Amino acid sequence: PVARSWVCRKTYVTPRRPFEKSRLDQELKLIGEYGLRNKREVWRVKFTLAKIRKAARELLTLDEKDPRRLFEGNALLRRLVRIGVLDEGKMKLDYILGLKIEDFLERRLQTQVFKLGLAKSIHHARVLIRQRHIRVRKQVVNIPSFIVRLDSQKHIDFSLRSPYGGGRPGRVKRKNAKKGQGGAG
Amino acid sequence: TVTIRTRKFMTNRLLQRKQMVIDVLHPGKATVPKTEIREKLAKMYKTTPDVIFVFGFRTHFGGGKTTGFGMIYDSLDYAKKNEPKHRLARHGLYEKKKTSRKQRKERKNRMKKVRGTAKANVGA
Amino acid sequence: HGSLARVGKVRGQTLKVAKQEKKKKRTGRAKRRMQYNRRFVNVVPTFGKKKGPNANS
Amino acid sequence: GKCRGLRTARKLRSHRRDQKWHDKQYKKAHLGTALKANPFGGASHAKGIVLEKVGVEAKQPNSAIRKCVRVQLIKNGKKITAFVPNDGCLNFIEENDEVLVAGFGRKGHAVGDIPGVRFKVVKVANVSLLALYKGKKERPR
RNA sequence: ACGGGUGACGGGGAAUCAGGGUUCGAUUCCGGAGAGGGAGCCUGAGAAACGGCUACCACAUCCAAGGAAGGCAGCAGGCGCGCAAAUUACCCACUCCCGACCCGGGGAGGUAGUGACGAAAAAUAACAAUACAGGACUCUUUCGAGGCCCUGUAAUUGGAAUGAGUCCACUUUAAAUCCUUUAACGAGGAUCCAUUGGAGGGCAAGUCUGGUGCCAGCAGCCGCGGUAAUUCCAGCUCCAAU
């Protein structure tokens, strides 16, 4: 007997079919608009959607006024409305079903540095995140996957401690600034 | 520009001490040494640095902020009394003996053979 | 034609000439982005029958 | 279903058991004769002492002499015809060298031309004969 | 029923899933059993105990030949059975136990080592200008002009960034290591160089070159190879996971 957990799960399911012609074209432009790095990445935005959607059909089997459905209603909904996927005027949960993969893929921080007046291309953004430049209320995220809260969005910026913000000159600017002193002498 | 703030304060009458969660802000430099941290509490609580004990500091990604669980006592007399040994050894006032638990188990099982006031001769 | 004398015959008698050189390969998104362009954002709806991407007449 | 009663429940259940023994991919399963026969005895690989190199002819339409081996296993002390795969790799078995035999694709059912043969090689003493083909490791002297 | 068999310890559970189902469960929680193989008892509130005791059987350790003791399915380890599984490492600091105890002790437990058994985050580049190629659009039956919005691949040219790394000290802690923090140094082929498998059809991608001449081999099934092979052996190209 030991003092540990063993606990974990996977996050992605792989499609029953291999070598299709209608699917091989449509997952590869999810890699263009937003700038993802492999399939795996994509496959899990779905699995999280798929998960939401099966619980919704679980609740719709129940009657109205059934106290589980009301409570677990609210929760399932607000859980999509603190992060702006659903909108205020769709409390009702038919509306949860008619709800697709592109709205999740643009909450991801990667996409949230392309759109806000602080990155030139999208494929620049997944290299600003990972070179530890940008931050979200005095706290540095290093992780595109970060799904973003709708409370936060007005607080994203360049971190204080940075050459692309306030700070001291860098590795390669300061070296060829230091090289100009070494050359003239 | 090093700044301390305490957090969750309590007093044990029945262990003879102040305890609290010391909280640090340090933008710009490496995490800080404890003979600096101690002596900065000492005019937060106007004692000497001697009695106070601060251990454990987890730091924060992005740089900035660390979190400790320091505790302040009344007199030195008591400070040896009601507190661990390792958390005196650090401050230079306790020293355990010079045999790790290889030696000492070999020497128990040779006393276990010998009988009576013959047991003292196996030990020198 | 061929007991256990006749073995390795063709892996043997082929013309072992060397492999070539080329400029260095890329991986990761940086790659994938590469192919995303090829097949979508540019290209012309060319007349009639489409030739595959490894085509030679 | 055919015996529709409400308290039949066993009449119904003594009949399917009876039946399922007619099922093959099962009886082959639920008697001891499948594992009595089998060389590996119940297993995914099992090593053995080679003893002679042997060419087997292929069956018709096709023709071409196919290069095999005749192994004795350890555990059982049993004798199998095996089969080398790659081109020019038979020059790598010396007689009475040791090999890690495997299965061959479809479980107790051969592949293609060569009759009887259900087994094949992965290793030749601690290094894989795949590698030897490429040349990524070479043989000790 | 009785007899036999079971690659049978039981249960909380696991993998697969439209609904119904079919397999698995020696294993961190409960309940059973056993300490090479049977048998029997001393001490006790609590044993048919076995890191207690006395036999016999199978096996194994010394002798000055009369004698005498041995039992890792506890931790590390090692010989064997094999397709088949790690260090004779370090502490009571935590966690809890036992005792005459606030004070000893604990391979129970904690901590490092080996570990592509599985699960989760996630690098191998990004951005400017000069050649060059495509579509709006204002106009041109068609040349050309603007390319504002670009859209793209080119050992052309240019500096901005960073994580791999080397290394002072803080931190971590029973004492170390790891992660977290920080000065000093650290990239143009960014040699600081991604594989493993396939290209006739099922099933994504060459009727291309240069060998072999039912031979050598491929091919899970249908099949290939008959001296012009879309299939072997290989040269350039290409698809799918990464």
Q: Which strands make up the sheet holding B10-12, listed edge to edge?
A: B10-12, B17-19, B71-73
Question: How close is the nearest chain C Cα to the Cα of A128, in Å?
Answer: 15
Here the CATH number for the domain that contains residue B38 is: 3.30.70.3370
Helix (H, G, I), strand (E, B) or coil at D119: coil
d(CA D121, CA D116): 16
- Answer yes or no: are the C-beta atoms of A144 and A108 closer than 8 Å: yes
> C-chain residues within 8 Å CB-CB of A31?
29, 32-33, 36
d(CA A109, CA C21): 41
Element (H, E) at B5: strand B3-5
Phi, psi of D56 (to 5 degrees): -110, 135
Of A96, A94, A64, A102, the closest CA to residue A78 belongs to A96
Q: How many CB atoms lie within 10 A of CB B41?
A: 20
Of A106, A176, A180, the closest CA to residue A148 belongs to A106
d(CA B37, CA B40): 5
d(CA A72, CA A76): 6
- Answer yes or no: are the C-beta atoms of A144 and A133 closer than 8 Å: no
**Beta strand pairing call for D79-81 and B10-12:** unpaired
Of B12, B11, B6, the closest CA to residue B69 belongs to B6
d(CA B93, CA C45): 85
- Answer yes or no: are the C-beta atoms of B67 and B21 closer than 8 Å: yes
Resolution to one decimal, Å: 3.2
d(CA D127, CA C22): 32
**Sequence-distant (≥ 6) Cβ neighbours of residue D57 within 8 angstroms:** D63, D65, D66
Q: Is chain A adjacent to chain B, meaning 3+ CB pairs within 8 angstroms?
A: yes
Rg of chain C in Å (alpha carbons): 22
**Beta strand pairing call for D98-102 and D46-56:** antiparallel
Structure tokens, D18: 């009876």
Distance C42 CA to E139 C1' (A): 26
Structure tokens, A105: 């893929």
Name the burial class of residue D119, with classes exposed (0-12), middle (13-18) and buried (19+) by CB atoms within 10 angstroms of its CB: buried
Question: Would an 8 Å CB–CB cutoff place A161 in contact with chain C?
Answer: no
d(CA B25, CA A59): 48
Q: Is the dihedral of CA A8, A11, A15, A19 positive or negative?
A: negative
- Answer yes or no: are the C-beta atoms of D59 and D116 closer than 8 Å: no
d(CA B108, CA B50): 40
Domain coverage including residue B65: 1-124
User: Which residue has 């005895």 as its token pair?
Assistant: D41
**Sequence-distant (≥ 6) Cβ neighbours of residue B9 within 8 angstroms:** B18, B19, B20
Question: Would an 8 Å CB–CB cutoff place A149 in contact with chain C?
Answer: no
Q: Is chain A adjacent to chain C, meaning 3+ CB pairs within 8 angstroms?
A: yes
Q: Strands, E, within D1-141: which ranges?
A: 46-56, 66-73, 79-81, 98-102, 120-123
d(CA D124, CA D109): 24
Distance A35 CA to E215 C1' (A): 54
Angle, vertex CA C11, rays to CA C7 and CA C13, nearest 5: 95
- State how many domains chain B has: 1
d(CA A137, CA A116): 16
d(CA B75, CA B77): 5
Using CA atoms, how far residue B60 sits from A10, A138, B33, B66, in Å, is 28, 11, 16, 6
Question: Would an 8 Å CB–CB cutoff place B63 in contact with chain A?
Answer: yes
Element (H, E) at A156: strand A156-158
Name the burial class of residue A65, with classes exposed (0-12), middle (13-18) and buried (19+) by CB atoms within 10 angstroms of its CB: exposed
d(CA D132, CA A136): 56
User: Which positions of strand E lie within 7 Å of protein CB atoms?
Assistant: 7, 28-29, 81-84, 90-94, 105-106, 108-111, 118-128, 134-135, 151-153, 155, 159-163, 168-175, 180-183, 186-187, 189-191, 193-194, 199, 203-208, 210-221, 223-225, 232-242
d(CA A33, CA A122): 8
Using CA atoms, how far residue D76 sits from A112, B10, B34, D71, D119, in Å, is 66, 75, 70, 12, 16
DSSP B8-77: S-EEETTTTEEE---EEE-TTSPPPPHHHHHHHHTTTTTS-STT-B----B--TTS-EEE---EEES-HH
| Strand E contact with C30 (CB < 7 A) | yes
- Answer yes or no: are the C-beta atoms of D86 and C6 closer than 8 Å: no
Question: Would an 8 Å CB–CB cutoff place B25 in contact with chain A?
Answer: no
